[PDB]
Amino acid sequence: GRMHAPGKGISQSALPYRRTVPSWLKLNADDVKEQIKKLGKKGLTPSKIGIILRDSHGVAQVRFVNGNKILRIMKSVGLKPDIPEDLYHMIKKAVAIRKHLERNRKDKDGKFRLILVESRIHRLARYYKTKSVLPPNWKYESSTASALVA
Amino acid sequence: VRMNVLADALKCINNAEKRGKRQVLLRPCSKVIIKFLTVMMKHGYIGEFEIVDDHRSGKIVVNLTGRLNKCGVISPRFDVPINDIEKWTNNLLPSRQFGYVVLTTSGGIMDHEEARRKHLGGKILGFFF
Amino acid sequence: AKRTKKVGIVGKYGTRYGASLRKMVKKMEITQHSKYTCSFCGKDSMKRAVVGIWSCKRCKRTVAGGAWVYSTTAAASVRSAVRRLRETKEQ
Amino acid sequence: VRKIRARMTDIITNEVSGADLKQLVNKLALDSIAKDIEKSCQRIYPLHDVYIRKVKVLKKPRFDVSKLLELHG
Amino acid sequence: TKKRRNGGRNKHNRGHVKPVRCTNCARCVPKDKAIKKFVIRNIVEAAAVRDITEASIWDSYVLPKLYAKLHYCVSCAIHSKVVRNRSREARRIRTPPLRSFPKDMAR
Amino acid sequence: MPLAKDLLHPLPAEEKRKHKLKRLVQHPNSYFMDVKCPGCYRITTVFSHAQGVVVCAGCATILCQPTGGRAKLTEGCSFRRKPQ
Amino acid sequence: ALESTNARLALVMKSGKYCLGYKQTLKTLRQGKAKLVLIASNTPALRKSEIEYYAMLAKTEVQHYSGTNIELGTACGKYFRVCTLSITDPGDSDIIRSLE
RNA sequence: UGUGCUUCAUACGUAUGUAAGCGUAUUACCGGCCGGUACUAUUACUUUGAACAAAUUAGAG
RNA sequence: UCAGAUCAAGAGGUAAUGAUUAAUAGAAGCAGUUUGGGGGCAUUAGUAUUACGACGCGAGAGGUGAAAUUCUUGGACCGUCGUAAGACUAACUUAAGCGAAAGCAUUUGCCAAAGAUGUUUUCAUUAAUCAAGAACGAAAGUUAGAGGUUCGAAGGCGAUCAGAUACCGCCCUAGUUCUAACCAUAAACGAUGCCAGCUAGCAAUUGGGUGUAGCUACUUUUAUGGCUCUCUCAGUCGCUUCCGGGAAACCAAAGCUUUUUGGGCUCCGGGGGAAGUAUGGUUGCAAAGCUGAAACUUAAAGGAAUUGACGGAAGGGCACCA
């Protein structure tokens, strides 16, 4: 593992075999609709909505309580992001390495960490322009980029 | 990364029978590789194996006898017609008494004795003797 | 296009003076004639009037700067050092 | 390490600002900081022998023997 | 051929490690490729100690010890015989022995 | 041991030991807390490795704190582990 | 550029209403409509001091932003420079309760 | 869409290795089970072909 | 009107009305808890080595195989309080850790980043490796400033020696130091490319998790901290031998390269020299770097091991041809 790092450590979620459990849920299964988007209107990316509802409702996995995933439910409401989330956070990192480098030069090991994160924004761009959620003519230019993520 | 499931479940068989274990755990059982063992099951080499059905990719816990000697895969899957099927049994299998080279012919997954009577050709999928 | 491979702004002295002093003055000949971003209103309009004095075309602020660079690194290490002595000696 | 080094620097800077040396050297003549630098930090780590090991007196305020007569007499 | 699996010593997950200076030789040999001797010594030989404890005003005045560390060039520790030319099966033994005597090197 | 051949049916304390991933069928080490905080007894269901703090209707304090692994409740959390 | 108001500005730039500049800001502050006025670091001291004298009269709170003209505009998504903005109806942000 | 059963044709109560019958309709008409007949996601691979000089070569007599 | 055909249907009604898994693949997140001589910038400490200032002392002192050079217009050496400067961060220091590699160690603050663990988080094949091309790259060397203690190529002396442009000894220069650039090589080594699956023991430790009323510091026991054994991930070390392998030395990989085998990808070699030379091209301020032959010559060069040789090789012993 780790395309840009040595550390081959494995860790993930272990989703069980049973699907439709909770067998104890208080309300409708599809009343997570009006709490995916009511916390989607607070600017939360669907990673944060997948874990804020593990503890209040507390729903286990959304793709078994409803029919489909969290990102598909938000654009059924109409809260899909301008740029998808694993590029929104991958660019905000590469923004911050450049803002650290416009005051702290002599640093050839924060610069190296920028070439890493920029060589993989160019790998998620090169894929999202194939599956057509990013259009063509969409590049990483690092002079407009800081007004996207902020 | 795994460019074959068939290599990462046939060396895993072959490494566990030269030590003489009686059960091998293979991962993660493409239906290509189930019908490879089913060729080997009905010629005695393999016991009645069990497919644990977890809904990610699958796992098999394959029983075996100990009659196996070398059960590997050929890669890349060379397309073999019928007239050049014996250039791949001569230089590969130990003698023309026994052993098989398994083919994925146009009809199914079969060995090289059933394919030469049914008159089918295909790709080489692996070998066992 | 690109008109010179290597001289840049010192092709104006062309074949005059020797390659090192052309190379040496070029570092200074670029930063002087540059437009620095104005640290008072934000525009790329902080150009050099005379040696050591820089001014901004809008906002009308003249500053006292370096001979070629707007702010020297030997003087921003004094503006830091003075305010870390000002932090101790005031409060 | 940095949590007890935090804790060793706040108690002894409560002791030093402590009614000048007639109290203070009497503390280290008891090692009274070394018995309170020890029992406080054992909520963080069980610590071994604590030795105060060095004191420089890099600055001296004044000579002024009016403050020396009760100090020597 | 590779005479040791260690090579020098301890060069794993470092790449390159700091050097120290030899004592007798004053080389610049690595810290890990170094015969080290944490030498503890009595100051007064413990045979002329009764001459000194005569002159002790206090409770016979238990004597302080000398403390040093002897970073050694390999070619200048074989020469001073801290280490010597082991057999190829005795080459592999690291921790044995302590197992000699009471306090050595004092004497 | 050429005969660990009850991979078909291992002893359930052995696979309990193994890992959430290294066993034959992956399974979480987690569960869900139907807690009863005695400040006000409205029951909130949280995760054990929580990935989120939680409030209640009446006793809405913190009820859970983040850690590396199992999230520690705040010592006044009369919970009961249950698949309800 | 503290990331606690840069994250909250980018929500008012999608859900909120504002006025992004100085002359529109005093239009709001005279009209009793601004809720919060961010002003830059770089903004000049008279423009600074009469923004706070309007916000004293209009009871709007002024956040002093921690960045220049070039950095308010970037953190507002815009490709120009802002030195003054007045958020008048935030949709989702809780910028009203965020202290300095 | 993998086969299962029901089978029967077929090596010896057993063996289908040709096929037929349930998984709602593996293409609509007339002819005497049978023909004209309407309709064919794709490429690589593979089966048998077509198609093309002789001498050579393999090689029949 | 049939309209051969061809656009759109009165759209509001009848179709289980449509999104496979979620990889012991990856990526990204997290109310996440951390952790590490990782990199940058400030700040700051430690003795030391100098060099000087006082003061006491009295003729020595450096050094070395023996020396001499050298330091004492005695005030040295030494003892002492000092002030100032530049370096270097000991001991703790490990078969520990971090890092892509080169490398990384006084605290404290701030900055940005990282592995790993945890996770009934998110996306859904985004991944693997790689000509060309990019970024970093010990030391030395080079430019341009600021420094300039210690050390010290070069140089200058003193010995030793048949000789001594050397080893040894003295003051030292470029350099070591910091900044802004260049250079792009090291035995840059594990002489061992990267991702992936399998195959075994045994013991330690780095990091995280989870049951030990195992202990245990005391607010009262509890909350924590420390350890205890017991698990568990990613390993890294260590040692023992394979159903391993190899020419061996040896190696849990350097094995699974069966009975010429087959997971994928990339680079390199084809006897020894001539030679990493000539030459062209390219990079460079230079030094030089990345490319890179042939003529002619040659029957061997080489690797791992074995017996003798039995020497500034240590050990244990013997003798009046010692």
JSON list of C-alpha atoms in Angstrom, two decimals, chain C residues 7-60:
[
{"chain": "C", "resi": 7, "resn": "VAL", "atom": "CA", "xyz": [21.08, 37.12, -20.89]},
{"chain": "C", "resi": 8, "resn": "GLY", "atom": "CA", "xyz": [17.59, 38.42, -20.23]},
{"chain": "C", "resi": 9, "resn": "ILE", "atom": "CA", "xyz": [17.64, 42.06, -19.16]},
{"chain": "C", "resi": 10, "resn": "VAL", "atom": "CA", "xyz": [21.39, 42.44, -19.76]},
{"chain": "C", "resi": 11, "resn": "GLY", "atom": "CA", "xyz": [21.33, 42.01, -23.47]},
{"chain": "C", "resi": 12, "resn": "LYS", "atom": "CA", "xyz": [21.17, 45.78, -23.47]},
{"chain": "C", "resi": 13, "resn": "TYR", "atom": "CA", "xyz": [24.87, 45.79, -22.48]},
{"chain": "C", "resi": 14, "resn": "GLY", "atom": "CA", "xyz": [25.45, 43.27, -25.17]},
{"chain": "C", "resi": 15, "resn": "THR", "atom": "CA", "xyz": [29.06, 41.99, -25.54]},
{"chain": "C", "resi": 16, "resn": "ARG", "atom": "CA", "xyz": [30.11, 44.85, -23.23]},
{"chain": "C", "resi": 17, "resn": "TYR", "atom": "CA", "xyz": [31.76, 44.32, -19.77]},
{"chain": "C", "resi": 18, "resn": "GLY", "atom": "CA", "xyz": [32.50, 40.61, -19.34]},
{"chain": "C", "resi": 19, "resn": "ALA", "atom": "CA", "xyz": [30.12, 37.82, -18.56]},
{"chain": "C", "resi": 20, "resn": "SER", "atom": "CA", "xyz": [30.36, 37.81, -14.78]},
{"chain": "C", "resi": 21, "resn": "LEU", "atom": "CA", "xyz": [29.64, 41.48, -14.22]},
{"chain": "C", "resi": 22, "resn": "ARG", "atom": "CA", "xyz": [26.71, 41.23, -16.61]},
{"chain": "C", "resi": 23, "resn": "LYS", "atom": "CA", "xyz": [25.56, 38.14, -14.71]},
{"chain": "C", "resi": 24, "resn": "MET", "atom": "CA", "xyz": [26.13, 39.94, -11.42]},
{"chain": "C", "resi": 25, "resn": "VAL", "atom": "CA", "xyz": [24.35, 43.18, -12.24]},
{"chain": "C", "resi": 26, "resn": "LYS", "atom": "CA", "xyz": [21.40, 41.27, -13.74]},
{"chain": "C", "resi": 27, "resn": "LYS", "atom": "CA", "xyz": [20.23, 40.11, -10.34]},
{"chain": "C", "resi": 28, "resn": "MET", "atom": "CA", "xyz": [20.00, 43.76, -9.31]},
{"chain": "C", "resi": 29, "resn": "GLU", "atom": "CA", "xyz": [18.77, 44.98, -12.70]},
{"chain": "C", "resi": 30, "resn": "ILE", "atom": "CA", "xyz": [15.68, 42.73, -12.40]},
{"chain": "C", "resi": 31, "resn": "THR", "atom": "CA", "xyz": [14.63, 43.52, -8.86]},
{"chain": "C", "resi": 32, "resn": "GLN", "atom": "CA", "xyz": [15.07, 47.16, -9.67]},
{"chain": "C", "resi": 33, "resn": "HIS", "atom": "CA", "xyz": [12.52, 47.65, -12.54]},
{"chain": "C", "resi": 34, "resn": "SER", "atom": "CA", "xyz": [10.31, 45.08, -10.90]},
{"chain": "C", "resi": 35, "resn": "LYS", "atom": "CA", "xyz": [6.91, 46.00, -9.61]},
{"chain": "C", "resi": 36, "resn": "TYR", "atom": "CA", "xyz": [6.58, 44.75, -6.06]},
{"chain": "C", "resi": 37, "resn": "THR", "atom": "CA", "xyz": [3.15, 44.36, -4.53]},
{"chain": "C", "resi": 38, "resn": "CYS", "atom": "CA", "xyz": [2.36, 47.41, -2.45]},
{"chain": "C", "resi": 39, "resn": "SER", "atom": "CA", "xyz": [2.23, 46.60, 1.22]},
{"chain": "C", "resi": 40, "resn": "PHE", "atom": "CA", "xyz": [-0.13, 49.47, 1.87]},
{"chain": "C", "resi": 41, "resn": "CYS", "atom": "CA", "xyz": [-3.00, 48.93, -0.59]},
{"chain": "C", "resi": 42, "resn": "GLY", "atom": "CA", "xyz": [-2.16, 45.66, -2.34]},
{"chain": "C", "resi": 43, "resn": "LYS", "atom": "CA", "xyz": [-1.44, 46.49, -5.96]},
{"chain": "C", "resi": 44, "resn": "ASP", "atom": "CA", "xyz": [1.55, 45.46, -8.10]},
{"chain": "C", "resi": 45, "resn": "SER", "atom": "CA", "xyz": [2.55, 49.11, -8.19]},
{"chain": "C", "resi": 46, "resn": "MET", "atom": "CA", "xyz": [5.47, 49.64, -5.81]},
{"chain": "C", "resi": 47, "resn": "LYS", "atom": "CA", "xyz": [8.20, 50.80, -8.16]},
{"chain": "C", "resi": 48, "resn": "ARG", "atom": "CA", "xyz": [11.48, 52.54, -7.53]},
{"chain": "C", "resi": 49, "resn": "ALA", "atom": "CA", "xyz": [12.00, 56.24, -8.00]},
{"chain": "C", "resi": 50, "resn": "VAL", "atom": "CA", "xyz": [15.59, 56.65, -6.92]},
{"chain": "C", "resi": 51, "resn": "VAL", "atom": "CA", "xyz": [18.12, 54.37, -5.18]},
{"chain": "C", "resi": 52, "resn": "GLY", "atom": "CA", "xyz": [16.66, 53.49, -1.85]},
{"chain": "C", "resi": 53, "resn": "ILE", "atom": "CA", "xyz": [13.27, 55.10, -2.24]},
{"chain": "C", "resi": 54, "resn": "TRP", "atom": "CA", "xyz": [10.18, 53.25, -3.47]},
{"chain": "C", "resi": 55, "resn": "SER", "atom": "CA", "xyz": [6.74, 54.68, -4.06]},
{"chain": "C", "resi": 56, "resn": "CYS", "atom": "CA", "xyz": [3.28, 53.56, -5.04]},
{"chain": "C", "resi": 57, "resn": "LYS", "atom": "CA", "xyz": [1.39, 55.05, -7.96]},
{"chain": "C", "resi": 58, "resn": "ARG", "atom": "CA", "xyz": [-1.97, 54.79, -6.27]},
{"chain": "C", "resi": 59, "resn": "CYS", "atom": "CA", "xyz": [-2.31, 55.37, -2.49]},
{"chain": "C", "resi": 60, "resn": "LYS", "atom": "CA", "xyz": [0.62, 57.84, -2.73]}
]
